[PDB]
Ligand SMILES: *[C@@H]1O[C@H](CO)[C@@H](O)[C@H](O)[C@H]1NC(C)=O
Ligand SMILES: *[C@@H]1O[C@H](CO)[C@@H](O)[C@H](O)[C@H]1NC(C)=O
Ligand SMILES: *[C@@H]1O[C@H](CO)[C@@H](O)[C@H](O)[C@H]1NC(C)=O
Ligand SMILES: *[C@@H]1O[C@H](CO)[C@@H](O)[C@H](O)[C@H]1NC(C)=O
């Protein structure tokens with residue numbers, strides 16, 4: 048459901064910023080915002096957690112709750128969003144401590160099915176991303192604990208998927224050392240084609256072509272590539288030597304575009320659209 | 336009660352209670368049972384204790400889903416003639 | 432929710448609306464949500 | 480049931496002879512009407528016996544079709560014609576020919592003397608020898624001879640016309656496959 | 672001007688005794704006002720121009736409504752019925 052709702056605030060902000068906001072387009076966008084709010088309020092559990100498949104509820108879903116908290120906070124600017132909903136969602140996130148050593152624990156076993164045993168770490172990283180992007184400062188205990196968990200993750204967690212999340216969180220928190228060293232390390236492992244740059248899944252387990260691994264258009268790589276594009280764009284000062292990198296990282300991502308806008312799936316089209324909006328934020332032609 | 340006069344006079348004292356009054360406000364919710372894909376047309380009415388119209392301002396009129404969340408809200412709703420007209424489309428999902 | 436290596440069977444009934452003759456085949460298309468590459472196809476025919 | 484098609488908040492002027500003018504929708508049901516009618520001088524009185532209104536057609540023509548069809552498949556169409564007049568009437572029904580889809584002549588022709596509360600089941604043979612969206616048009620002439628069948632209609636009816644459009648979507652057999660190739664051009668007074 | 676719950680007391684004072692008797696009549700609800708809602712034609716086609724001739728108290732702001740009756744055959748409990756308004760008034764028949 049959160050595929051017609053995640054990209055609308057970002058595209059609306061992009062249009063408003065680049066002197067392209069229209070009154071009727073804004074009205075129609077607010078209309079779709081309300082409509083998606085109407086469907087999404089249906090899945091709410093009385094505990095304050097959000098779980099999919101309302102007809103068959105199953106003890107909430109922490110990842111889905113975090114994603115909904117993200118979307119409602121970022122979309123509350125235009126349409127009405129109940130503040131008590133957000134308050135009790137944050138209360139549920141608080142009560143969902145489940146501190147496995149220094150790491151939080153994810154609730155539900157349906158979403159992060161490809162990150163492996165790093166499910167809890169990736170959930171903590173995504174929760175931190177949500178807290179940062181939710182206009183929340185680093186003064187709360189949840190954010191402090193999440194940053195403490197991510198700080199002690201350089202040695203372990205040798206997965207390109209979780210590296211993308213850590214790149215995004217360390218880009219969100221303005222840093223000069225950890226973010227830069229992680230981006231420099233990840234920039235070594237970049238797959239380059241004719242005029243394009245991206246990141247493969249690096250799924251070394253079973254690197255073959257016959258047993259259902261021949262599909263080249265894996266949706267997972269687009270998400271990590273969009274994370275890299277957004278993180279590098281969200282720098283102190285992108286130099287001219289980095290604009291060519293932006294062009295090369297954007298052409299590949301925009302290549303996997305269908306005839307309707309959706310690239311591969313719900314989770315990755317959102318990140319790709321927001322990354323494209325941020326990339327086009329820096330470039331504009333007055334006449335074109 | 337005083338019955339002063341030329342003949343006999345009577346002085347009497349009884350006890351009553353004066354009580355405060357509130358005003359009654361009503362919902363003319365037409366279409367008693369709804370189906371998804373419709374448009375709910377409210378009508379707020381404000382009335383004195385005796386059935387007379389009074390001007391009333393509303394601040395926190397809102398809906399509530401079966402889950403308990405406020406879906407759409409109105410702020411500073413003034414009664415034009417003691418009648419308030421409100422409109423709200425219902426989404427095609429419309430959780431029963 | 433998931434499809435493991437063990438075979439899982441699903442079944443349901445279907446009524447008739449407007450009658451039509453010389454009915455051709457139909458399609459069953461199954462695919463993972465987050466990875467469209469791992470997908471399968473199957474044919475459907477009238478029992479009669 | 481339809482929607483409440485009138486919702487105005489009209490005010491009363493002078494003694495009160497207000498006329499609400501509206502347009503009724505297509506739903507064939509009842510139209511119960513009520514109000515509440517406030518006034519700062521006196522009060523308000525809800526009506527006790529609500530007003531009743533009805534909309535109906537003397538002649539019904541109905542088509543029932545599936546949502547989609549397969550290429551080159553013989554489908555039969557079912558056209559239902561209903562008569563609600565107090566007199567038994569006759570009817571002839573015609574289908575507009577077209578070249579996009581072929582219609583197989585069923586060689587069936589009967590002028591049933593339908594009466595009050597009656598309905599027929601006229602049918603035709605249709606092959607899905609086209610692609611995309613196809614429109615079906617039915618027509619009626621309502622040659623009736625109103626007084627049962629033997630008694631001539633004379634000056635009873637002139638012409639009732641009921642034509643309804645219908646939509647069908649035939650698609651080639653198989654599954655829908657797509658291949659997209661998105662390209663970005665960065666040109667500074669250059670041609671690609 | 673008599674709402675539901677009109678109670679009757681008839682009493683006599685003979686020479687030294689006062690005797691009273693009371694009952695609790697119910698009156699039909701009337702709301703001290705007159706309304707004469709009615710259409711112009713009882714029947715019509717499905718795309719006709721419906722004319723509705725209403726008369727009521729002079730200088731009245733007056734809200735109308737039209738609904739399919741099939742709902743009343745499902746849930747025949749109209750909100751704001753001629754008894755709901757009256758039952759929503761405090762102390763309409765004293766007790767003690
Ligand atoms: C667009 O940006 C301007 C500049 O900050 C702001 O005042 C305005 O509220 C924005 N509009 C929307 C719809 O966000
Ligand atoms: C949230 O946004 C406001 C701008 O309205 C800003 O002043 C504030 O610093 C942001 N962060 C927090 C934690 O409030
Ligand atoms: C019901 O509503 C209207 C009839 O007034 C029509 O447009 C719609 O298709 C109907 N749907 C069904 C399922 O009868
Ligand atoms: C209208 O319908 C109501 C429904 O009970 C009925 O009582 C009344 O007699 C009908 N006719 C008029 C003129 O109100």
Ligand SMILES: *[C@@H]1O[C@H](CO)[C@@H](O)[C@H](O)[C@H]1NC(C)=O
Nearest residue numbers: 335665666667668669670671
């Ligand atoms: C575009 O085409 C015109 C021909 O009308 C030509 O004169 C011009 O040089 C071309 N390039 C640009 C940047 O206008």
Ligand SMILES: *[C@@H]1O[C@H](CO)[C@@H](O)[C@H](O)[C@H]1NC(C)=O
Nearest residue numbers: 500501502718719720721722
């Ligand atoms: C209103 O009624 C008149 C005469 O019956 C005619 O113009 C038409 O039926 C209605 N108006 C519209 C715009 O349909």
